[PDB]
């Protein structure tokens, strides 16, 4: 909820600094992705409604323990609000924040030898919207600049013209580009008037709608409940 | 040589491993409580000739008021409940409902969510294995009352072994004619019509003479921990509705005549103790599905 | 002694009927005592969308 | 109307409290000073009593 | 010898009149005496000595 | 070719065409509501020591005060409910009750007689016909659980056609030993214990191997629109009472073991749709008859 | 040849204790309080407070519930359990004192008796099916009787059906249409279904040589019961009590359901007096089921 509410590059990067990797990953096994399933949408049809499970559905799915699984889990958290199930990551990586995993060399993780085309295919980039596409490219650029693979990032953008049009305009090493950036990246937010409490056809659309509807209640009643648990505890 | 077994006990498919935590259990218990309020409010609305009781109950249930020129199906609560029921049945069924929706829906009421407050008695009779000699024919028919028909041709005094498993608590045997039955390495008692057996005592040997087919009718009782709100009449009715609507039309699954056979078949499989816990949560969810669907009837012939 | 959720629980010597009636009355009034945020949610459902 | 009135689902707590008190008045009568049975016996008959 | 007694008062009952009517009338008086007729919240956490 | 059918499906008798209007439906719903309060009055009579709750409810039901002299029968409402049940079963039964009396009895309560606001699950198994070759013998037994026993005595395997009708929603088949069932013009599947079928798809072919007998157990589920106050347990009890009391004793009718068999048999007639509506109203009346006769036995 | 129902064979005698007016009041009081105990538990679970359950348990068990100690049910539970044991068999001891039962019966007042209502029991009694030479008869089932008959002789055979004299109505259905009529009466045309009154007398059914005939039988019997009787609860109580071992006493007969228990005792000499005790056992089992569900031990 908090990650999807951020609407600026500054706010998104600030949030990733304060958020440990534990929030990105999940401890629920979920189901295997890329499965043609029939779900129930009784609002519209009596028959079952076909759909395909993906990594950006907003529901935890099983993921491998390699470097790609950890990166895919982080990107899913940014664009869908929920991560995947990577078994036994270890306390050493869980305490580190998301940005250090993306943009630092002290994590002990070798993020080189990463193919952005393969990762984009696995995350179903063809199904995500402009804001989700923009957030995914931000993670790619941070990973590319840390490992000195700026050429491979440019090659990926050249092959994908639609992604090149909406590419973020910041440079990871320069602070001036971050402050002057005018991108809008807010998936959820408090809307003028309201939105009907009705279901949607797709798994992604319905889960995204559930986040928007619950944001208003989460905004008002989160400070006290979080503080009660935060008090008398040490942060990871 | 020949081996026979109950039809409903063969190849129990795995159950879902999702939505079994404390928060998900609270969501199911909330759904059952609010679905019950929907049924009573519909009765009150019918008697009072007003829509006030139904609107209040539906608004609490669906977070939205009933809408004109728009079928009332239950809103997001109905969608979440229907999908988790599908997930409980099989692993092949997907996990679609996010965790944020469940926590929001679980906060509507103040239910405990305990799944081990009380007990229930299930009547499905498990006949795991009936072993017969070469010249004897054995048939097992039925789930609520198993009729075992055995014919012996030639020779004399064929010995048939009965294996009722270990989960069932008590099994009652009734025969068309008095018959002899005793445990392994025990003397055979005088022929009598009925026997009361503990399935854990061991395999049971029954003496079957030549001619005059003897039919044994067996009824069993099994106790399973269930919540206090559990009602078997509502669960069974919800089970049939779910099957008719197609919620259980998943690949590589087994279909059963009743919830009694479902819970017993899962109990008799390997790691069946942890399967029963998921089945009980499915029973409570089907209880809510039945009351919700009777209050709001979408299907019209 | 304090309860888990911050309430204060008093253990005293009192009658069976006086305890039964008083505590039942408390439980009846308590289910109608709700937080302000929950009250706002109920109000918002009654008023128009804007 | 009084006889045929049906209690609403959201009945007021004051009604629930009064029904609780009235039920305890009938169910547990010894608390409020009345009983359903009494026994009259001469003095020379020894009756087992609460000692 | 010693004993503990619960004193809720004496409420005479007439045999001819219906018991439920008398119970309801006495219920109103008992609730008023106990102070539970109006919505209330118990405040007894400060009733202690150290 | 041998044709075997379910016993309960044959010759459904015509049902009554009376007391199906809005006013009469409100009368049956009023009777169910007032009979429910009559039963509850007994428990409310036990919490106190008086009979005022029972006397109060009887007066509402019977329009007369109970008296210790005579046996409590039920007054005008009892006679109306009894006679209306008879008219539902057969068209030959007279419509004795006037409509003026029904309208008066319907004004006691403010219920609405909407009989299509819910559904119920009916477990009778409709087997319209089982067609078998010459050498095979087929026996169908039971209604709630259909045990079809088939024996093949010929040299080769036989194909047996199953017709479950076009009304039942789902039918579950369980066999003593694994068997193969496929729809017409479809390849035979491997041998399995359990088959789930939708009757509307088409007739089913079952392969009968030569040897030991094969027994198939069938369970069906059918959804029928019913009032929300429908209670299947109470309806079944009332059906047994009405049968015992002789309410159904009339020439040229068919008798059934349970209300499950009755409603399914009527539904499977030539024009069974119009019969189901009357049968449902009979069930609600039977539900009121059970509650009232238990409180007031004669 | 003679074939009889399995559940009708040798009904064991029932207990002769705890059948007076005071004991009957104890069972009715126990059922009333057990029902309130299970209703409060459901209300307790829904709400935050456990006040309704504490008051119900205190009335039932005469002591306040405690978190450390298990909820046994108190002296009422112990008295109810032993009284159920005594009803089943005459060999079971009658140890519970009458003064203790009288004290428990004074907890509440019940305005009713054990003869103010009725219940329909759907257990089909087949006392005997007399069959001639070369006629194989098998009787399977209690709720639904499956009489499978097959004859090998050249001529058609007559089979006698005796359904006793207690059942009110018996409904017969066959796999194929068959002819059945009373003794010394002309045979009707073949029909699929028959409705019979068991008082009418023994019935004759003909058997053709061709194929086996299976007759499915259902019955209804009316027995006077208290108005608080509930067949669903007494069935659950019967199964629970059997599993708990309350019926494990020597030289007794075990039945699949309370339906078969009451019918078999009815179809015996001195059956009218046995049935009254069985009805008291039914209400006691109704209380036992409700209490055990709220307080599993």
Short mmCIF file of C-alpha atoms in Angstrom, two decimals, chain F residues 2 4-8 10 38-39 42-43 45-51 137-147 237 240-241 243-246 248-249 254-258 261 289-290 293-298, chain G residues 28 31-32 35-36 108-112 115-120 122 143-144 146 148 168-169 171-177 191-195 211-212 214-222 224-225 227-229 286:
data_model
loop_
_atom_site.label_atom_id
_atom_site.label_comp_id
_atom_site.label_asym_id
_atom_site.label_seq_id
_atom_site.Cartn_x
_atom_site.Cartn_y
_atom_site.Cartn_z
CA UNK F 2 -34.30 -54.77 -22.44
CA UNK F 4 -35.25 -50.77 -17.31
CA UNK F 5 -36.63 -47.67 -15.60
CA UNK F 6 -36.81 -46.23 -12.11
CA UNK F 7 -39.92 -47.37 -10.25
CA UNK F 8 -40.88 -43.94 -8.89
CA UNK F 10 -43.66 -44.03 -13.82
CA UNK F 38 -47.20 -22.39 18.17
CA UNK F 39 -44.27 -24.78 18.59
CA UNK F 42 -44.29 -24.56 24.25
CA UNK F 43 -40.69 -23.64 25.08
CA UNK F 45 -44.32 -21.98 28.41
CA UNK F 46 -41.50 -23.91 30.10
CA UNK F 47 -39.34 -20.90 31.02
CA UNK F 48 -42.26 -19.67 33.12
CA UNK F 49 -44.85 -21.91 34.79
CA UNK F 50 -47.90 -20.48 32.99
CA UNK F 51 -49.69 -21.47 29.79
CA UNK F 137 -29.54 -58.46 -17.20
CA UNK F 138 -29.95 -55.01 -15.65
CA UNK F 139 -31.69 -54.20 -12.35
CA UNK F 140 -32.25 -50.67 -11.01
CA UNK F 141 -32.99 -50.34 -7.29
CA UNK F 142 -33.56 -47.28 -5.12
CA UNK F 143 -34.30 -43.59 -5.56
CA UNK F 144 -31.98 -41.60 -3.29
CA UNK F 145 -29.07 -43.90 -4.23
CA UNK F 146 -29.61 -45.83 -7.47
CA UNK F 147 -27.86 -49.21 -7.39
CA UNK F 237 -41.88 -35.18 8.26
CA UNK F 240 -45.17 -38.95 6.26
CA UNK F 241 -47.84 -37.58 8.60
CA UNK F 243 -49.73 -40.10 4.21
CA UNK F 244 -50.46 -41.77 7.56
CA UNK F 245 -53.41 -39.48 8.32
CA UNK F 246 -55.02 -40.41 4.99
CA UNK F 248 -53.60 -38.58 0.15
CA UNK F 249 -56.16 -41.43 0.09
CA UNK F 254 -49.57 -42.69 -7.18
CA UNK F 255 -47.87 -43.01 -3.80
CA UNK F 256 -44.24 -42.10 -3.11
CA UNK F 257 -41.81 -42.83 -0.29
CA UNK F 258 -40.63 -39.23 0.18
CA UNK F 261 -39.39 -38.70 -5.07
CA UNK F 289 -49.03 -29.35 8.83
CA UNK F 290 -46.11 -31.05 10.58
CA UNK F 293 -50.12 -31.46 14.21
CA UNK F 294 -47.15 -32.04 16.53
CA UNK F 295 -48.31 -29.24 18.84
CA UNK F 296 -51.94 -30.44 18.57
CA UNK F 297 -52.16 -34.20 17.97
CA UNK F 298 -55.51 -35.87 17.36
CA UNK G 28 -36.57 -32.70 30.72
CA UNK G 31 -32.45 -31.05 28.00
CA UNK G 32 -33.69 -27.51 28.67
CA UNK G 35 -29.97 -26.36 24.94
CA UNK G 36 -29.41 -23.03 26.69
CA UNK G 108 -35.98 -25.52 36.39
CA UNK G 109 -39.69 -26.15 35.89
CA UNK G 110 -40.92 -27.98 32.78
CA UNK G 111 -44.55 -27.63 31.68
CA UNK G 112 -45.10 -30.81 29.72
CA UNK G 115 -46.92 -38.12 25.77
CA UNK G 116 -47.90 -34.72 24.34
CA UNK G 117 -46.43 -35.14 20.84
CA UNK G 118 -45.28 -37.73 18.31
CA UNK G 119 -42.44 -38.59 15.95
CA UNK G 120 -42.32 -40.59 12.71
CA UNK G 122 -38.81 -44.70 9.23
CA UNK G 143 -34.13 -47.67 6.54
CA UNK G 144 -34.84 -49.09 3.07
CA UNK G 146 -34.03 -54.57 -0.24
CA UNK G 148 -34.06 -59.70 -3.51
CA UNK G 168 -48.86 -47.46 10.13
CA UNK G 169 -48.13 -47.49 6.38
CA UNK G 171 -44.73 -48.42 0.68
CA UNK G 172 -43.45 -51.07 -1.73
CA UNK G 173 -41.57 -50.52 -4.98
CA UNK G 174 -40.08 -53.06 -7.35
CA UNK G 175 -37.45 -53.22 -10.06
CA UNK G 176 -40.12 -54.51 -12.46
CA UNK G 177 -43.92 -54.46 -11.98
CA UNK G 191 -47.89 -52.26 -10.78
CA UNK G 192 -44.57 -50.69 -9.86
CA UNK G 193 -45.70 -49.38 -6.45
CA UNK G 194 -48.07 -50.47 -3.69
CA UNK G 195 -49.30 -48.78 -0.52
CA UNK G 211 -35.48 -62.63 -13.79
CA UNK G 212 -34.79 -61.65 -10.17
CA UNK G 214 -36.10 -56.68 -5.92
CA UNK G 215 -38.69 -55.03 -3.67
CA UNK G 216 -37.79 -51.74 -1.97
CA UNK G 217 -39.75 -51.11 1.23
CA UNK G 218 -40.26 -47.99 3.33
CA UNK G 219 -42.35 -47.61 6.47
CA UNK G 220 -43.60 -44.98 8.91
CA UNK G 221 -44.31 -45.54 12.61
CA UNK G 222 -45.66 -42.97 15.06
CA UNK G 224 -45.52 -40.63 21.42
CA UNK G 225 -42.64 -38.32 22.38
CA UNK G 227 -42.73 -31.86 22.28
CA UNK G 228 -39.03 -30.98 22.70
CA UNK G 229 -38.02 -34.16 20.84
CA UNK G 286 -30.68 -35.22 23.06
#
